[PDB]
């Protein structure tokens, strides 16, 4: 089965796992730091999605070292995941356009 489509899926499943683990770890890392707001799971999950898509509203963000390290992993996983989907869409268009020319 087409690799680009398989990697896209794998990418989606993996991103969903990173979001959940990131939500868990962000809370674990931020509690104990005075002033921290990334401290309950439901909003932490919203924050992770917010970060992965790189939207970053600024309603929530990490203030501790480990919270930031978790944030980086989430940003990168999201950028990579969506970037991989774009790449797969490119392979589909390239392959089909070849057909449209015969090859």
């Amino acid at each position: 089965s087409a690799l680009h489509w398989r990697a896209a899926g794998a990418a989606t499943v993996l991103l969903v796992i990173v979001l959940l683990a990131g939500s868990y770890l962000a809370v674990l890392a931020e509690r104990g730091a005075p002033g921290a707001q990334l401290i309950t799971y439901p909003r932490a999950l919203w924050w992770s999605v917010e970060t992965a898509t790189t939207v970053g509203y600024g309603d929530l963000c990490p203030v501790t070292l480990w919270g930031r390290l978790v944030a980086v992993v989430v940003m990168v996983a999201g950028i990579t995941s969506f970037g991989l989907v774009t790449a797969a869409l490119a392979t589909w268009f390239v392959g089909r356009e070849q057909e449209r020319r015969g090859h």
Partner: antibody, heavy 118, light 108 residues
């Protein structure tokens, strides 16, 4: 059924230490935090600290002298709080409460009355 | 560290009347405020979560409202069983903190 079981009382000699327990039942999730709150007769609720069993990390109220140490035994669903070198100022009712990681204390224990006397 | 002010400390009301407890936060905390009831010799009991959300098992008589820095816990038609201490608690910023408490008193 009672979700958080705490012993009714503990007598402690000044300077000595004691270990309070709080065993849970009912639904337990990876996201649960067990909190400890101190209440002096006639006064209000004071947050002491918290611990997440599924991981084992604990945080404490920074504004007060640290006289507590929290631990959790995953196998017997019990959270413990070690108070050490107590004086009369430590005499109070100590409650444990469970929080599902969403900020509010859904359920509280009956509380353990601790008296520091000779 | 967020400070929660509950004033007045004591509130007197006549049976059946409407009562309101106030809780003021030192800084804006959305609706991350929760209310607890503690009868004499009893442990705290959750009444309202997130400023206005109902909890199952709590008389529909209880309601909360507010957002930002000002919060209100209301009881419509007070009665003897409501005599207790009422506390607000915030979960917006670490560490969680409690208000100083407001005693409900009935005039019969």
């Amino acid at each position: 059924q009672v979700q958080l079981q705490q012993p009714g009382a503990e007598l402690v000699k000044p300077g000595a230490s004691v270990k309070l327990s709080c065993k849970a039942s009912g639904y337990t999730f990876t996201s649960d935090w067990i909190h400890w709150v101190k209440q002096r007769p006639g006064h209000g609720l004071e947050w002491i600290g918290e611990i997440i069993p599924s991981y084992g990390r604990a945080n404490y109220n920074e504004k007060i002298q640290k006289k507590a140490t929290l631990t959790a035994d995953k196998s017997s669903s019990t959270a413990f709080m070690q108070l050490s070198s107590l004086t009369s100022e430590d005499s109070a009712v100590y409650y444990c409460a469970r929080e599902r990681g969403d900020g509010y204390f859904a359920v509280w224990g009956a509380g353990t009355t601790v008296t520091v006397s000779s | 560290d967020i400070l929660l002010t509950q004033s007045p400390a004591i509130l007197s009301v006549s049976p059946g009347e409407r009562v309101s407890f106030s809780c003021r936060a030192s800084q804006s905390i959305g609706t991350d405020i929760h209310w607890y009831q503690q009868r004499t010799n009893g442990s705290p009991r959750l009444l309202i979560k997130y400023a206005s959300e109902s909890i199952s098992g709590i008389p529909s008589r209880f309601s909360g409202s507010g957002s930002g820095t000002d919060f209100t816990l209301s009881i419509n038609s007070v009665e003897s069983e409501d005599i207790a201490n009422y506390y607000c608690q915030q979960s917006n910023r670490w560490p969680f903190t409690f208000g100083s408490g407001t005693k409900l008193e009935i005039k019969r």
